[PDB]
Design a binder for this molecule. Structure first.
Ligand SMILES: CCCCCCCCO[C@@H]1O[C@H](CO)[C@@H](O)[C@H](O)[C@H]1O
Ligand SMILES: CCCCCCCCO[C@@H]1O[C@H](CO)[C@@H](O)[C@H](O)[C@H]1O
Ligand SMILES: CCCCCCCCO[C@@H]1O[C@H](CO)[C@@H](O)[C@H](O)[C@H]1O
Ligand SMILES: CCCCCCCCO[C@@H]1O[C@H](CO)[C@@H](O)[C@H](O)[C@H]1O
Ligand SMILES: CCCCCCCCCCCC
Ligand SMILES: CCCCCCCCCCCC
Ligand SMILES: [Ca+2]
Ligand SMILES: [Ca+2]
Lengths: 255, 256
């Protein structure tokens, strides 16, 4: 029963109640640069705008609680990120890009304590990340990963290392830009949450950072502001660098 | 509270890391009688389209303001998303054929109006946008002002949702000929099993479509689910296209 424990939440016991995995938000954004050369096969690409509506849905699905003892769970998750040219009525406001991220995993709610920090989540599983397109906009990669989440007072730190498995023919140099792990830091400043999510490949010099700030405006809606800077904001832009700023609303933050 | 009442659920305060569902949430593997290659001929991969597809629906309710118009009312929003995915079509890099995005803003009320055995439980008024996220020439969209009314009686649930089309429907001008002005939903609780039927019919044109389903709990959060769709308007790109589609897979929540 811990703020930010995905798995501890999933263990909690009516049947019309869904569980979140990651953050759920809808924001209005502008990017520094639109990647028009990657989406050149789309008819509307020449007239693509830098202002878009960005949103993420993310859900956890407990399938088997107690598979490996009282504090474990066989679970699934689904994260979806979409970039939508709403203001671009000239081209019938199309979606530029969606990322679909299903996962299947074994999760453990833990309490290992070291140096003031408490390891709360240990999660191991399969991750698929694709963009739902055909050639040549198709982008896709699969990962075996471990997610480890620890908290210390107002801090939350999450490390997610992975191993790429299978084909990456659509984007074979993706690990050059994405790296082999993802770091997440949350900071709780009163009821406000400062957040940072990113990757850095130290042998290639590539990475990207997502910084955010949210605060409850009501007991229903949080205000949320986001900056993304770097490579790999979306699969179609994994090898593309830009800076994006957005404002909007959020249900859940990382803790 | 009451099984099947979206509004009654939305009024229950909870732990802020719990979402509310609006419609059903499911993931099924499907085979259609006919794939509408014609409508999607603009896509490079259209002629190698395969009749087997993954279909899934996500649907969430978002309480914005409880008590806006009294203790049993709510200002809310919903988002329903349906996707058809050519998973098996590795030859074309398994693209999505079609997604429908259905955001709503509404005023809802939890009621207790009993009449001839049936108890009206949900009264909902709001705005609906239904788009496919495409550009010319595959773009399909329509806006609607609707009322949703849900009533129950023993093992039965009946939901009627009549609407009024508003604004331009320039991507699909004759959409009302295949969809109609209302949607009917019937749920039946047979033990832990749920029979469901969801449909529309235009009496003046003879066009319609129906979706029948059966689900059974495997666990407290997961159900096995089978679906048959038959008729017109399964998706926006197929509003004027007739097909029969059968699917099997898993479900979180059924209609009650
Ligand atoms: C924090 C949210 C950013 C607000 C910026 C949104 C409005 C800017 O919109 C801009 O209009 C231009 C011409 O009219 C387009 O060509 C640009 O690509 C578009 O970004
Ligand atoms: C509520 C925790 C009771 C204190 C016993 C936990 C032992 C952990 O040990 C220490 O605890 C301190 C907090 O007491 C931390 O600041 C130290 O850095 C940590 O190493
Ligand atoms: C039995 C002691 C109860 C009083 C605990 C107050 C001490 C606050 O100390 C806190 O201890 C936590 C537990 O290790 C650490 O995680 C925090 O980082 C630390 O500051
Ligand atoms: C989102 C549109 C702006 C209107 C603000 C909605 C106000 C929140 O509304 C209400 O606040 C009450 C007091 O905390 C609670 O008792 C309710 O459960 C909550 O919904
Ligand atoms: C059971 C809840 C529905 C979850 C939908 C996830 C489907 C994964 C999509 C994969 C796209 C490439
Ligand atoms: C919390 C996330 C809600 C997402 C709302 C998306 C609305 C998309 C409309 C696109 C149709 C063309
Ligand atoms: Ca693909
Ligand atoms: Ca459109």
């Amino acid at each position: 029963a811990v703020r930010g424990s995905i798995i501890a939440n999933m263990l909690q016991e009516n049947p019309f109640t869904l569980y979140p995995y990651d953050t759920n938000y809808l924001i209005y954004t502008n990017t520094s640069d639109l990647n028009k050369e990657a989406i050149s096969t789309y008819n509307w690409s020449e007239n693509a705008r830098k202002d878009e509506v960005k949103f993420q849905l993310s859900l956890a699905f407990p399938l088997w609680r107690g598979i490996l003892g009282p504090n474990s769970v066989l679970g699934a998750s689904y994260t979806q990120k979409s970039w939508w040219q709403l203001s671009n009525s000239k081209e019938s406001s199309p979606f530029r890009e969606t990322n679909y991220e299903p996962q299947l995993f074994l999760g453990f709610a833990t309490d290992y304590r070291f140096a003031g920090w408490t390891l709360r989540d240990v999660e191991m599983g399969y991750n698929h990340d694709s963009n739902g397109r055909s050639d040549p906009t198709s982008r896709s990669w699969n990962r075996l990963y471990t997610r480890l989440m620890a908290e210390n007072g107002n801090w939350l730190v999450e490390v997610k290392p992975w191993y790429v498995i299978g084909s990456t023919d659509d984007n074979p140099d993706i690990t050059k830009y994405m790296g082999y792990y993802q770091l997440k830091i949350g900071y709780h400043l009163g009821e406000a949450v400062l957040s940072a999510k990113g990757q850095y490949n130290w042998n290639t010099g590539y990475g990207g950072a997502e910084v955010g700030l949210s605060y409850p405006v009501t007991k229903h809606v949080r205000l949320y502001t986001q900056v993304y800077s770097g490579y790999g904001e979306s699969l179609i832009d994994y090898n593309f660098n830009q800076t994006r700023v957005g404002v909007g609303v959020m249900l859940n933050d990382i803790f």
